[PDB]
Design a protein around this ligand. Sequence first.
Ligand code: HEC
Length: 104
Amino acid sequence: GDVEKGKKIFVQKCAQCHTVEKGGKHKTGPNLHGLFGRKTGQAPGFTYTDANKNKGITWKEETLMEYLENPKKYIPGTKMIFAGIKKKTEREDLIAYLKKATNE
Ligand code: HEC
């Protein structure tokens, strides 16, 4: 993906509820630093729904590609409000940006 476009997408569609920087505060949603290779529902200090807490998957590109297309469908009962990113290219860009920034 295009990391720069991914950043734009993050700023426009995710930043209002999430941070990606280390020690960034929990907002409406959990901080996403260290997201890749981590199980669902594990950010310490965030109170998840039971659905998100017990989804039982590992966040990585494949799982993010599916989630971000339609969060509700992938984790029914999530309290995250997001319709989904319908275009594959934009999803890849965002995911590529998150892969960089959440490990940075
Ligand atoms: C508020 C309006 C949000 C927007 C916009 C986005 N997210 Fe979100 N996200 C939000 C909440 C409240 C939660 C917790 C959900 C629950 O049911 O407990 C989430 C959760 C996630 C997760 C899962 C993280 C985990 O630790 O398991 C991810 C990966 C995530 N959110 C990513 C994400 C992205 C990439 C967004 C923009 C594309 C985005 N979210 C928007 C609240 C909100």
